[PDB]
């Protein structure tokens, strides 16, 4: 079956969808420890804007608390903790202004 | 509500999930025309492997046919066509052998 154009276009459009977020990406300062999992799946804005120069960007967001395991790299001891991650609730195709 | 560890781990695990695939990525030779949408959403393997050195890779796949609009960049004339895309059906955390 050929997937209809409207359906194809609808799914690739800029919107919030499940996205993998490395803990190190959300928290650049967490450079020493081991985390399990090393990334989390939360909703983030993504899609190919009709105007190819625009970026799918969040215009709405909230925070979600996730249980993560922190592992001490030297002793290998594990400990559970709650870690906050930004989740996108609304998205729009926006221009990326030229900085500088 | 804090999302439980098991649920967190389950979603970030290597598995097939909705992924944006630019038409130019699937077809590197399609360098001249304009496509609407410019990318499609199909299932692809992604996730953070428990062993951080391993890559989430497909071990099963099939092809899906999608309706895409091809636009002539000089005349701006549109035409619908069916375009094939690889979709991943099974995934595994596999080693990335050092080439060379």
From Swiss-Prot, chains A, B:
User: Does the record carry Endoplasmic reticulum as a key word?
Assistant: no
Q: Which cystines does this chain contain?
A: 14-56, 45-91, 49-93
Q: Name one GO biological process term.
A: vascular endothelial growth factor signaling pathway
Keyword list, A-Z: Disulfide bond, Growth factor, Pyrrolidone carboxylic acid, Secreted, Toxin
GO molecular-function term, one example from the UniProt record = growth factor activity
SUPFAM superfamilies per the UniProt record, alphabetical: Cystine-knot cytokines
Question: Which family is this protein grouped under?
Answer: Belongs to the PDGF/VEGF growth factor family. Snake venom VEGF subfamily.
What other facts are recorded?
Answer: Negative results: does not interact with VEGF receptor-1 (Flt-1), VEGF receptor-3 (FLT4), and neuropilin-1 (NRP1).
The task this protein performs is described as:
Snake venom VEGFs that may contribute to venom dispersion and prey subjugation by inducing vascular permeability and hypotension. This protein induces an increase in capillary permeability after intradermal injection, as well as a drastic hypotensive effect after intravenous injection. The hypotension is mediated by nitric oxide (NO), which is produced by VEGF-activated endothelium NO synthase. Also induces angiogenesis in vitro, probably through VEGF receptor (KDR/VEGFR-2) signaling.
Name of the protein in its database record: Snake venom vascular endothelial growth factor toxin HF
Source taxonomy: Eukaryota, Metazoa, Chordata, Craniata, Vertebrata
């Amino acid at each position: 079956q050929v997937r209809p154009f409207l359906e194809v276009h609808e799914r690739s459009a800029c919107q919030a969808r499940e996205t993998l977020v490395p803990i190190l990406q959300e928290y650049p300062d967490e450079i020493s420890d081991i985390f399990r999992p090393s990334c989390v799946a939360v909703l983030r804005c993504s899609g190919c804007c009709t105007d190819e120069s625009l970026k799918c960007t969040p215009v709405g967001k909230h925070t979600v608390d996730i249980q993560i395991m922190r592992v001490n790299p030297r002793t290998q001891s594990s400990k559970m903790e709650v870690m906050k991650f930004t989740e996108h609730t609304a998205c729009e195709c926006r221009p990326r202004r030229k900085q500088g």
